[PDB]
Amino acid sequence: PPSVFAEVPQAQPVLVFKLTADFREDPDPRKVNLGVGAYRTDDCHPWVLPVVKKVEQKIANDNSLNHEYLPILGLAEFRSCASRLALGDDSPALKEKRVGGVQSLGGTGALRIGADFLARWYNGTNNKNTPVYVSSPTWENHNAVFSAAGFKDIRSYRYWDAEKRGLDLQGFLNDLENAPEFSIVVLHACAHNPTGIDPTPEQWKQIASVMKHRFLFPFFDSAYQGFASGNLERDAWAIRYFVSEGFEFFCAQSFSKNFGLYNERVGNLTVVGKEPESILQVLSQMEKIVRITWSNPPAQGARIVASTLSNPELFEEWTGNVKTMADRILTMRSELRARLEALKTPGTWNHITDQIGMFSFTGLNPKQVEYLVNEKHIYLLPSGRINVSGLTTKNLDYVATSIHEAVTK
Ligand SMILES: Cc1ncc(COP(=O)(O)O)c(C=O)c1O
């Protein structure tokens, strides 16, 4: 009689997922949800980018388009344009033909494929022992993805200094100095998730130095290019510096946020190598991994991105749309800080504006968060992370005052 699945454990729900359900259930009228995982407008709505609507119309009216399998690595124009976006149009890595691009299922898919490749071809053959370094507090799914790829030794580098509400550069650099040679280091290219604190360009030069000295492999996660600061070139400054300093690396790019195309699963794994012929080989093995995962990737999202990035007018319109998003986020930061200061809230609050991108470590501790959630119906994670786009001109006063109460009490 007993089912073949009878002993399958009910998996634990994701913290963010439970939080938002608890919010929806909750009936008090002042409630705010600062744990949503995507950009929201000043009216608490999703935002389809005008350029996306425009390009979707053009796609729908282009009768030349068929539905035949894309190549295993993906739409050629999307892969070139995507890597060009990250590396910059006059990159030497590109001029010297030592850049590969694998279209992937969002940033998550690019991390996965990259991880699978490394667990098989990097630092030897099938070396699952190579240490993988991730930022202390990091995107939850970094660990899970590298574990799924087979890596058994996943480590933390120091990053968030709760005391000083900022980057522990010395901790970070120290941990990097002690890393076994050839260890993989998962770096946030900009808009650190979930803290919002990035290294400055000068701190990046120091990070790179240690990495170069200890032959560490950079695996960049670039989920926010342009969206972070409104400035595409500045958001890619670290990536381009590592290029200029001769590094070989992977960079997992997502277009979920910067195009608002979350549900079309558009990503690209950029590969930068020393010599061209070697890159051809890497791609050849990327194909094998893709084949046993998704076979080949979906077209619609990649078509939108490719059409946009290859047309200068649409490119301009898109950068405008992105700037709208980064300007709103900047503004809500500036205003949250100004209000907390005007209420003379204990502690410093410059971290709120030193941070960049949609997510902010507020610096509240778990008891303080418990107060906001339980007493004030303001929903955020124990870590004190908020989605800054969940701040609105309507709820700002209430949130600032609630945070003042929390810190004071
Ligand atoms: C730092 C970082 N990397 C990668 C991703 C992957 O997202 P997606 O697979 O939707 O592109 C996210 C999503 O929030 C993120 O914050």
CSV table of C-alpha atoms and ligand atoms in Angstrom, one decimal:
chain,number,residue,atom,x,y,z
A,1,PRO,CA,0.0,0.0,0.0
A,2,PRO,CA,2.5,2.8,0.9
A,3,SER,CA,3.1,5.6,-1.7
A,4,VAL,CA,6.6,5.8,-3.3
A,5,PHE,CA,6.7,9.5,-2.2
A,6,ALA,CA,5.5,8.7,1.4
A,7,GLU,CA,8.8,9.7,3.1
A,8,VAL,CA,9.3,12.9,1.0
A,9,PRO,CA,9.7,15.9,3.5
A,10,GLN,CA,7.5,19.1,3.0
A,11,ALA,CA,10.2,21.6,2.2
A,12,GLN,CA,10.4,24.8,4.3
A,13,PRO,CA,8.9,27.9,2.6
A,14,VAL,CA,11.3,30.7,1.6
A,15,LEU,CA,11.5,33.5,4.1
A,16,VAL,CA,10.6,36.2,1.6
A,17,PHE,CA,7.6,34.1,0.4
A,18,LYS,CA,6.2,33.6,3.9
A,19,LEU,CA,6.7,37.3,4.8
A,20,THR,CA,4.6,38.5,1.9
A,21,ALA,CA,1.8,36.0,2.5
A,22,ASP,CA,1.7,37.0,6.1
A,23,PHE,CA,1.4,40.6,4.8
A,24,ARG,CA,-1.5,39.9,2.5
A,25,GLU,CA,-3.4,38.1,5.1
A,26,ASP,CA,-2.9,40.9,7.6
A,27,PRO,CA,-5.8,43.3,7.8
A,28,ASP,CA,-4.6,46.4,9.7
A,29,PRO,CA,-4.8,49.4,7.3
A,30,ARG,CA,-1.3,50.8,7.9
A,31,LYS,CA,0.5,47.8,6.7
A,32,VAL,CA,3.5,48.2,4.3
A,33,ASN,CA,5.4,45.4,2.5
A,34,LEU,CA,9.1,46.3,2.2
A,35,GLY,CA,10.1,42.7,1.3
A,36,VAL,CA,8.8,42.5,-2.3
A,37,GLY,CA,11.5,41.2,-4.6
A,38,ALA,CA,11.0,43.5,-7.6
A,39,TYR,CA,10.6,47.1,-8.6
A,40,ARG,CA,7.4,48.8,-7.6
A,41,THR,CA,6.1,52.3,-8.6
A,42,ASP,CA,5.1,55.2,-6.2
A,43,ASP,CA,1.6,53.6,-6.5
A,44,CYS,CA,2.6,50.1,-5.3
A,45,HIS,CA,2.3,48.7,-8.9
A,46,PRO,CA,4.6,46.7,-11.2
A,47,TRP,CA,6.0,48.7,-14.1
A,48,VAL,CA,6.2,47.5,-17.6
A,49,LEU,CA,8.9,49.7,-19.3
A,50,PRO,CA,7.6,51.8,-22.2
A,51,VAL,CA,10.4,50.6,-24.5
A,52,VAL,CA,9.4,47.0,-23.7
A,53,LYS,CA,5.8,47.6,-24.7
A,54,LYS,CA,7.1,49.3,-27.9
A,55,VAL,CA,9.4,46.4,-28.8
A,56,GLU,CA,6.7,43.8,-28.0
A,57,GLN,CA,4.5,45.5,-30.6
A,58,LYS,CA,7.3,45.4,-33.2
A,59,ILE,CA,7.9,41.7,-32.4
A,60,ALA,CA,4.2,40.9,-32.7
A,61,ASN,CA,4.0,42.7,-36.1
A,62,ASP,CA,7.2,41.2,-37.6
A,63,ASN,CA,6.0,38.4,-39.8
A,64,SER,CA,9.5,37.2,-40.6
A,65,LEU,CA,9.9,35.6,-37.0
A,66,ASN,CA,9.5,31.8,-36.6
A,67,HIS,CA,9.5,29.6,-33.5
A,68,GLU,CA,12.3,27.2,-34.6
A,69,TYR,CA,14.9,26.2,-31.9
A,70,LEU,CA,17.5,28.8,-31.1
A,71,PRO,CA,21.1,27.6,-31.0
A,72,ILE,CA,22.1,25.8,-27.8
A,73,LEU,CA,24.0,28.9,-26.6
A,74,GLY,CA,21.2,31.2,-27.6
A,75,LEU,CA,20.3,34.1,-29.9
A,76,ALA,CA,23.5,35.4,-31.4
A,77,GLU,CA,22.6,39.1,-31.4
A,78,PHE,CA,21.5,38.9,-27.7
A,79,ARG,CA,24.7,37.2,-26.6
A,80,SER,CA,27.0,39.8,-28.4
A,81,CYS,CA,25.0,42.8,-27.3
A,82,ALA,CA,24.7,41.6,-23.7
A,83,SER,CA,28.4,41.0,-23.3
A,84,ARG,CA,29.1,44.4,-25.1
A,85,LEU,CA,26.8,46.1,-22.5
A,86,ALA,CA,28.9,44.7,-19.7
A,87,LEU,CA,32.4,45.1,-21.2
A,88,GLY,CA,31.8,48.4,-23.1
A,89,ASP,CA,31.9,48.7,-26.9
A,90,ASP,CA,35.7,49.3,-27.2
A,91,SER,CA,36.7,46.5,-24.8
A,92,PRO,CA,40.1,44.9,-25.9
A,93,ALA,CA,38.8,41.5,-24.7
A,94,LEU,CA,36.2,41.9,-27.5
A,95,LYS,CA,38.6,43.4,-30.1
A,96,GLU,CA,40.9,40.4,-29.3
A,97,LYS,CA,38.0,37.9,-29.7
A,98,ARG,CA,38.5,36.4,-26.2
A,99,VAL,CA,34.9,36.9,-24.9
A,100,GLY,CA,32.2,34.1,-24.9
A,101,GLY,CA,28.4,34.6,-24.1
A,102,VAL,CA,25.9,31.9,-23.1
A,103,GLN,CA,22.2,32.9,-23.0
A,104,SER,CA,20.7,31.7,-19.9
A,105,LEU,CA,17.5,31.5,-17.8
A,106,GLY,CA,18.0,34.8,-15.9
A,107,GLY,CA,20.9,35.5,-13.7
A,108,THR,CA,20.1,32.3,-11.8
A,109,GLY,CA,20.5,30.2,-14.9
A,110,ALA,CA,23.8,31.9,-15.8
A,111,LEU,CA,25.2,31.2,-12.2
A,112,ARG,CA,24.0,27.6,-12.5
A,113,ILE,CA,25.6,26.9,-15.8
A,114,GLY,CA,28.9,28.7,-14.8
A,115,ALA,CA,29.0,26.8,-11.6
A,116,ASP,CA,28.4,23.4,-13.4
A,117,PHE,CA,31.2,24.3,-15.8
A,118,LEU,CA,33.7,25.1,-13.0
A,119,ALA,CA,32.8,22.0,-11.0
A,120,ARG,CA,33.8,20.0,-14.1
A,121,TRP,CA,36.6,21.8,-16.0
A,122,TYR,CA,38.2,24.3,-13.5
A,123,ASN,CA,41.2,23.8,-11.1
A,124,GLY,CA,41.5,20.2,-12.5
A,125,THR,CA,38.9,17.8,-13.7
A,126,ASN,CA,35.7,17.3,-11.7
A,127,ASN,CA,37.2,19.2,-8.8
A,128,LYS,CA,34.4,19.7,-6.3
A,129,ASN,CA,36.9,20.8,-3.6
A,130,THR,CA,37.8,24.2,-5.0
A,131,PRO,CA,36.6,26.7,-2.3
A,132,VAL,CA,33.8,29.0,-3.4
A,133,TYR,CA,33.7,32.4,-1.6
A,134,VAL,CA,30.5,34.4,-1.2
A,135,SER,CA,29.8,37.7,0.6
A,136,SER,CA,28.8,37.2,4.3
A,137,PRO,CA,25.3,38.3,3.8
A,138,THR,CA,24.6,37.5,0.2
A,139,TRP,CA,21.8,36.6,-2.1
A,140,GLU,CA,20.4,33.3,-0.5
A,141,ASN,CA,20.6,31.5,-3.7
A,142,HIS,CA,24.4,31.9,-4.3
A,143,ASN,CA,25.1,29.1,-1.8
A,144,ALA,CA,22.3,26.9,-3.0
A,145,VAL,CA,23.3,27.1,-6.6
A,146,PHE,CA,27.0,26.4,-6.0
A,147,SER,CA,26.0,23.4,-3.7
A,148,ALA,CA,23.7,22.1,-6.5
A,149,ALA,CA,26.6,22.2,-8.9
A,150,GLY,CA,28.6,19.9,-6.5
A,151,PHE,CA,30.9,22.3,-4.6
A,152,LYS,CA,31.4,21.0,-1.1
A,153,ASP,CA,33.4,23.9,0.4
A,154,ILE,CA,31.4,27.1,0.3
A,155,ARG,CA,32.9,30.0,2.4
A,156,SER,CA,32.0,33.5,3.6
A,157,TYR,CA,34.0,36.6,3.1
A,158,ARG,CA,33.4,39.5,5.5
A,159,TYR,CA,31.4,42.3,3.9
A,160,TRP,CA,28.8,43.9,6.1
A,161,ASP,CA,30.0,45.7,9.2
A,162,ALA,CA,26.9,46.0,11.3
A,163,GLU,CA,28.7,48.2,13.8
A,164,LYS,CA,29.7,50.7,11.3
A,165,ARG,CA,26.8,50.0,8.8
A,166,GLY,CA,29.3,49.7,5.9
A,167,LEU,CA,31.9,47.7,4.2
A,168,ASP,CA,34.4,45.8,6.2
A,169,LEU,CA,37.2,46.3,3.7
A,170,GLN,CA,39.9,44.9,6.0
A,171,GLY,CA,38.0,41.8,6.8
A,172,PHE,CA,37.2,41.3,3.1
A,173,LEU,CA,40.8,41.8,2.1
A,174,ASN,CA,42.1,39.6,4.9
A,175,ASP,CA,39.8,36.7,4.0
A,176,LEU,CA,40.9,37.0,0.4
A,177,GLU,CA,44.6,37.0,1.3
A,178,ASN,CA,44.0,33.6,3.2
A,179,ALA,CA,42.1,31.9,0.3
A,180,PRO,CA,43.7,28.9,-1.3
A,181,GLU,CA,45.1,29.8,-4.7
A,182,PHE,CA,42.6,29.4,-7.5
A,183,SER,CA,39.5,29.6,-5.2
A,184,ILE,CA,36.4,31.0,-6.8
A,185,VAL,CA,35.1,34.4,-5.5
A,186,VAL,CA,31.4,35.4,-6.2
A,187,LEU,CA,31.4,39.1,-6.5
A,188,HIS,CA,28.5,41.6,-6.8
A,189,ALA,CA,29.5,43.9,-9.6
A,190,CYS,CA,27.3,46.7,-8.2
A,191,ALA,CA,24.2,47.2,-6.0
A,192,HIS,CA,25.2,44.6,-3.5
A,193,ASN,CA,22.2,42.4,-2.6
A,194,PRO,CA,21.0,42.6,0.1
A,195,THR,CA,23.0,45.3,1.7
A,196,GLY,CA,23.2,48.0,-1.0
A,197,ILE,CA,26.9,48.8,0.0
A,198,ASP,CA,29.4,48.6,-2.9
A,199,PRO,CA,33.1,49.1,-2.8
A,200,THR,CA,34.3,52.4,-4.2
A,201,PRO,CA,36.6,52.2,-7.2
A,202,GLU,CA,39.7,52.6,-4.9
A,203,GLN,CA,38.5,49.7,-2.7
A,204,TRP,CA,38.0,47.6,-5.9
A,205,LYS,CA,41.7,48.2,-7.0
A,206,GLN,CA,42.6,46.7,-3.6
A,207,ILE,CA,40.2,43.7,-4.0
A,208,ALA,CA,41.6,43.0,-7.5
A,209,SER,CA,45.3,43.2,-6.2
A,210,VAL,CA,44.8,40.5,-3.7
A,211,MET,CA,42.8,38.4,-6.2
A,212,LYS,CA,45.6,38.7,-8.8
A,213,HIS,CA,48.2,37.8,-6.2
A,214,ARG,CA,46.4,34.7,-5.1
A,215,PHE,CA,45.1,33.7,-8.5
A,216,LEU,CA,41.5,33.8,-7.4
A,217,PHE,CA,38.8,33.3,-10.0
A,218,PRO,CA,36.2,36.2,-10.1
A,219,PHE,CA,32.6,35.0,-10.7
A,220,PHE,CA,30.8,38.3,-11.1
A,221,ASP,CA,27.1,38.5,-10.5
A,222,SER,CA,25.7,41.6,-12.5
A,223,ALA,CA,22.0,41.6,-11.8
A,224,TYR,CA,21.6,45.5,-11.8
A,225,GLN,CA,23.6,47.1,-14.5
A,226,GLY,CA,22.1,50.6,-15.1
A,227,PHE,CA,19.3,50.0,-12.7
A,228,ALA,CA,21.6,50.5,-9.8
A,229,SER,CA,22.8,54.1,-10.4
A,230,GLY,CA,21.1,55.0,-13.7
A,231,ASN,CA,24.5,54.9,-15.3
A,232,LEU,CA,25.4,51.9,-17.4
A,233,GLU,CA,29.1,52.7,-17.7
A,234,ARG,CA,29.6,53.3,-13.9
A,235,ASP,CA,27.7,50.2,-12.9
A,236,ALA,CA,30.2,48.1,-15.0
A,237,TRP,CA,33.3,49.9,-13.8
A,238,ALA,CA,34.6,47.0,-11.7
A,239,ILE,CA,34.0,44.4,-14.4
A,240,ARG,CA,35.9,46.6,-16.9
A,241,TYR,CA,38.8,47.1,-14.4
A,242,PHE,CA,39.2,43.4,-14.0
A,243,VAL,CA,39.3,43.2,-17.8
A,244,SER,CA,42.0,45.9,-18.1
A,245,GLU,CA,44.0,44.2,-15.2
A,246,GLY,CA,44.2,41.0,-17.4
A,247,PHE,CA,41.8,38.8,-15.4
A,248,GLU,CA,40.0,35.7,-16.7
A,249,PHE,CA,36.5,35.5,-15.3
A,250,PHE,CA,32.7,34.7,-15.5
A,251,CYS,CA,30.0,37.3,-15.2
A,252,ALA,CA,26.4,36.2,-14.8
A,253,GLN,CA,24.2,39.0,-16.2
A,254,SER,CA,20.5,39.4,-15.5
A,255,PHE,CA,18.0,41.6,-17.4
A,256,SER,CA,15.2,40.9,-15.0
A,257,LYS,CA,15.4,44.2,-13.2
A,258,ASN,CA,17.0,46.6,-15.7
A,259,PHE,CA,14.4,45.6,-18.4
A,260,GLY,CA,11.6,44.7,-16.0
A,261,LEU,CA,11.5,41.3,-17.8
A,262,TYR,CA,11.5,39.1,-14.6
A,263,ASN,CA,9.1,36.5,-16.1
A,264,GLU,CA,10.9,36.1,-19.5
A,265,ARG,CA,14.0,34.7,-17.8
A,266,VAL,CA,16.7,36.6,-19.7
A,267,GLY,CA,20.3,36.3,-18.7
A,268,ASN,CA,23.7,35.9,-20.2
A,269,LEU,CA,26.9,34.3,-18.9
A,270,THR,CA,29.8,36.3,-20.1
A,271,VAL,CA,33.1,34.5,-20.2
A,272,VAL,CA,36.4,36.5,-20.4
A,273,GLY,CA,39.6,34.5,-21.2
A,274,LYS,CA,43.3,34.8,-22.0
A,275,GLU,CA,43.3,33.5,-25.6
A,276,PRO,CA,40.5,33.1,-28.3
A,277,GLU,CA,40.9,29.4,-29.2
A,278,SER,CA,40.5,28.5,-25.6
A,279,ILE,CA,37.2,30.3,-25.3
A,280,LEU,CA,35.8,28.4,-28.2
A,281,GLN,CA,36.5,25.2,-26.2
A,282,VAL,CA,34.8,26.5,-23.1
A,283,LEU,CA,31.6,27.3,-25.1
A,284,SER,CA,31.7,23.8,-26.6
A,285,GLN,CA,31.4,22.4,-23.1
A,286,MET,CA,28.9,25.0,-22.0
A,287,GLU,CA,26.7,23.5,-24.8
A,288,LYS,CA,26.8,20.1,-23.2
A,289,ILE,CA,25.7,21.4,-19.9
A,290,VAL,CA,22.9,23.5,-21.5
A,291,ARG,CA,21.7,20.5,-23.5
A,292,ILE,CA,21.1,18.4,-20.4
A,293,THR,CA,19.4,21.3,-18.5
A,294,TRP,CA,17.1,23.2,-20.8
A,295,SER,CA,18.3,22.0,-24.3
A,296,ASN,CA,18.2,25.6,-25.7
A,297,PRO,CA,16.9,28.9,-24.3
A,298,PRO,CA,13.5,30.8,-24.9
A,299,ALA,CA,13.4,33.5,-27.5
A,300,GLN,CA,10.9,36.2,-26.5
A,301,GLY,CA,12.9,38.0,-23.7
A,302,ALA,CA,16.2,37.8,-25.5
A,303,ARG,CA,14.5,39.2,-28.7
A,304,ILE,CA,13.3,42.2,-26.7
A,305,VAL,CA,16.7,42.9,-25.2
A,306,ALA,CA,18.5,42.4,-28.6
A,307,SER,CA,16.2,44.7,-30.5
A,308,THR,CA,16.6,47.3,-27.8
A,309,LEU,CA,20.4,47.2,-27.5
A,310,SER,CA,21.1,47.1,-31.2
A,311,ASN,CA,18.9,50.1,-32.1
A,312,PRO,CA,20.4,53.5,-30.9
A,313,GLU,CA,16.9,55.1,-30.5
A,314,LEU,CA,15.5,52.2,-28.5
A,315,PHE,CA,18.7,52.1,-26.5
A,316,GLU,CA,18.3,55.7,-25.7
A,317,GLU,CA,14.6,55.2,-24.8
A,318,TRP,CA,15.6,52.3,-22.6
A,319,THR,CA,18.3,54.2,-20.7
A,320,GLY,CA,15.7,56.8,-20.0
A,321,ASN,CA,13.3,54.2,-18.6
A,322,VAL,CA,16.1,52.8,-16.4
A,323,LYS,CA,17.0,56.3,-15.2
A,324,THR,CA,13.4,56.8,-14.2
A,325,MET,CA,13.8,53.7,-11.9
A,326,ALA,CA,17.2,54.6,-10.4
A,327,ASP,CA,16.0,58.2,-9.8
A,328,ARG,CA,12.9,57.0,-7.9
A,329,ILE,CA,15.1,54.7,-5.7
A,330,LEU,CA,17.7,57.5,-5.1
A,331,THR,CA,14.9,59.9,-4.2
A,332,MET,CA,13.3,57.5,-1.7
A,333,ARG,CA,16.7,56.9,-0.1
A,334,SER,CA,17.4,60.7,0.2
A,335,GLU,CA,13.9,61.3,1.6
A,336,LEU,CA,14.0,58.4,4.2
A,337,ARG,CA,17.4,59.6,5.5
A,338,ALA,CA,16.2,63.3,5.6
A,339,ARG,CA,13.2,62.3,7.7
A,340,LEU,CA,15.0,60.0,10.1
A,341,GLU,CA,17.5,62.9,10.7
A,342,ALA,CA,14.8,65.5,11.1
A,343,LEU,CA,13.2,63.3,13.8
A,344,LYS,CA,16.7,63.2,15.3
A,345,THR,CA,16.9,59.4,15.3
A,346,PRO,CA,19.9,58.0,17.2
A,347,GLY,CA,22.8,56.7,15.1
A,348,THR,CA,24.1,57.8,11.7
A,349,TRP,CA,21.9,57.4,8.6
A,350,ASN,CA,24.3,58.3,5.7
A,351,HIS,CA,24.4,54.5,4.9
A,352,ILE,CA,20.9,55.0,3.5
A,353,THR,CA,22.4,57.3,0.8
A,354,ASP,CA,25.9,55.7,0.5
A,355,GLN,CA,24.1,52.5,-0.5
A,356,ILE,CA,23.1,52.1,-4.2
A,357,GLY,CA,20.3,50.1,-5.8
A,358,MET,CA,16.9,48.7,-4.8
A,359,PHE,CA,17.8,46.9,-1.5
A,360,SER,CA,19.1,48.5,1.7
A,361,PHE,CA,20.4,47.1,4.9
A,362,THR,CA,18.7,49.6,7.2
A,363,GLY,CA,21.0,48.7,10.1
A,364,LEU,CA,18.2,47.7,12.4
A,365,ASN,CA,18.8,44.6,14.5
A,366,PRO,CA,16.3,41.7,14.8
A,367,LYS,CA,14.5,43.0,17.9
A,368,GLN,CA,14.0,46.4,16.1
A,369,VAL,CA,12.6,44.5,13.0
A,370,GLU,CA,10.3,42.4,15.3
A,371,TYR,CA,8.9,45.8,16.6
A,372,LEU,CA,8.3,47.1,13.0
A,373,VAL,CA,6.7,43.8,11.9
A,374,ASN,CA,4.7,42.8,15.0
A,375,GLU,CA,3.8,46.4,16.3
A,376,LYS,CA,3.8,48.6,13.2
A,377,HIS,CA,2.8,46.1,10.4
A,378,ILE,CA,5.9,47.1,8.3
A,379,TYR,CA,7.2,43.9,6.8
A,380,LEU,CA,10.8,43.3,6.2
A,381,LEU,CA,13.3,40.5,6.9
A,382,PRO,CA,15.1,39.9,10.3
A,383,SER,CA,18.3,41.0,8.5
A,384,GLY,CA,16.8,44.6,8.3
A,385,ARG,CA,16.8,44.5,4.5
A,386,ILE,CA,14.2,46.7,2.7
A,387,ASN,CA,13.2,47.1,-0.9
A,388,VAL,CA,13.6,50.9,-1.2
A,389,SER,CA,10.9,51.0,-4.0
A,390,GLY,CA,8.4,49.8,-1.4
A,391,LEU,CA,8.8,53.3,0.0
A,392,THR,CA,6.1,55.7,-1.4
A,393,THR,CA,5.3,59.4,-0.8
A,394,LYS,CA,2.1,58.0,0.9
A,395,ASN,CA,3.8,55.6,3.4
A,396,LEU,CA,7.1,57.4,4.0
A,397,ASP,CA,6.1,59.4,7.1
A,398,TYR,CA,4.7,56.4,8.7
A,399,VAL,CA,7.8,54.2,8.0
A,400,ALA,CA,10.3,56.9,9.1
A,401,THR,CA,8.4,57.5,12.3
A,402,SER,CA,8.1,53.7,12.9
A,403,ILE,CA,11.8,53.3,12.4
A,404,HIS,CA,12.5,56.2,14.8
A,405,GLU,CA,10.3,54.5,17.5
A,406,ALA,CA,12.1,51.3,16.9
A,407,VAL,CA,15.5,52.6,17.3
A,408,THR,CA,14.6,54.7,20.3
A,409,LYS,CA,12.7,52.1,22.2
B,1,LIG,C1,22.4,39.6,-6.9
B,1,LIG,C2,21.5,38.8,-7.7
B,1,LIG,N1,21.9,37.9,-8.7
B,1,LIG,C3,21.1,37.2,-9.4
B,1,LIG,C4,19.7,37.3,-9.4
B,1,LIG,C5,19.0,36.3,-10.3
B,1,LIG,O1,17.7,36.8,-10.8
B,1,LIG,P1,17.1,36.3,-12.1
B,1,LIG,O2,17.4,34.8,-12.3
B,1,LIG,O3,15.6,36.7,-11.9
B,1,LIG,O4,17.7,37.1,-13.2
B,1,LIG,C6,19.1,38.2,-8.4
B,1,LIG,C7,17.7,38.4,-8.1
B,1,LIG,O5,17.2,39.1,-7.3
B,1,LIG,C8,20.1,39.0,-7.5
B,1,LIG,O6,19.7,39.9,-6.6
